[PDB]
């Protein structure tokens, strides 16, 4: 199975534009360079398909990639269902994802009129209407912001790379 194409991928998505790679016909394997390896519904089997979801967030937002969490990531960027069967894997990526002047390129959604439903993706760049006045693309705010990752920030504010495997109903 081409799990290598997902874990060892040179470029990762912004969490708001999280990347999904469909895995179909092949076999899985085993995985000390990961700070988080948490499975839900199974434990370290065969399945119809495997989905590999991958993106970058802050270290202290990794708690939010789990069933029934809240926060700007779980609510407005990447939502897991309460009944989720799959594994959540993260690791510190300060070496690849932080830059001297601040890395702008990794963005998150800060504002949204309601919560995402589980596994929903929203790539919208449309101005968020907070107040009564409709917004002429200028109480009118841009909904995406940058993490600006810097190599010197504390572990909590460093970029972590996350891979979510979903198993729907490939053999281990």
């Amino acid at each position: 199975c081409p799990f290598g194409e997902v874990f060892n991928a040179t470029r990762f998505a912004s969490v708001y534009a999280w990347n999904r790679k469909r895995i179909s016909n092949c076999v899985a394997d085993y995985s000390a360079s990961f700070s988080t390896f948490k499975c839900y519904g199974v434990s370290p089997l065969c399945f119809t398909n495997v989905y590999a979801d991958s993106f970058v967030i802050r270290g202290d937002e990794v708690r939010q990639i789990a069933p029934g969490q809240t926060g700007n990531i779980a609510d407005y960027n990447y939502k897991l269902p309460d009944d989720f069967t799959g594994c959540v894997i993260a690791w510190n990526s300060n070496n690849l994802d932080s830059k001297v002047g601040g890395n702008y390129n990794y963005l998150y959604r800060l504002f949204r009129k309601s919560n995402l439903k589980p596994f929903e993706r929203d790539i919208s760049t449309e101005i968020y209407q907070a107040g009564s006045t409709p917004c002429n693309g200028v109480n009118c705010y841009f909904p995406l912001q940058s993490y600006g990752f810097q190599p010197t920030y504390g572990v909590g504010y460093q970029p972590y790379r996350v891979v979510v495997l979903s198993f729907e109903l490939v053999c281990g």
Partner: antibody
Amino acid sequence: EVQLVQSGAEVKKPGDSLKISCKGSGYSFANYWIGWVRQKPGKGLEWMGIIYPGDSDTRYSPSSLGQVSISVDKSISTAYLQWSSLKASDTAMYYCARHPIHGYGSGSLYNPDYWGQGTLVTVSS
Amino acid sequence: SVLTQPPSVSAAPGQKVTISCSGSNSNIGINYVSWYQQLPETAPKLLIYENNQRPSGIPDRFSGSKSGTSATLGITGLQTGDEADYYCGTWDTSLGAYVFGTGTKVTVLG
């Protein structure tokens, strides 16, 4: 075989603009970070920075940020290092080097593997 | 932030030399160390990667190790062709930059 073929020797005066070239063959140019190292006559290697050909994302060293600018033309598999105003102190050999990602998860780092033959830049008034 | 190497080492053909590379917890302490060989008037060449791995074509006379914040290159059965500048390197996590050591001149004593 991976090959990194660099532009020819450059003779310039202070205040001149200069763009040097490095073309990658024998691999998918687009999928690999590539960057620049400086060696002044009889001195150590000085890492300057790297670029991801796909989307021109960059990493500069403290010393090299703002001084110099790295760019790419993904279609001709070519990486570029560019000054708008050369100083005499920019006289050096400049090597391009491919930076595959070595290691795995938290041990992942950008890492020089293959080097070009070098480009001598001689800046005298 | 500097990876410090001895400026120069020498020995007779057939002897062993070691080249130390001392850094900090932001560089050698956390990250994979590489070594680069630069023969007079040539481009550097990767000699060692991931602390102790040899690229295809690099003889097992060349060995690498890392312990704490210092790495070491050993060259056994020193040969004329080994006379070169050697540089360690790694990524400095705190700097967000690759760093090369100060470099060592190996002399094969004739």
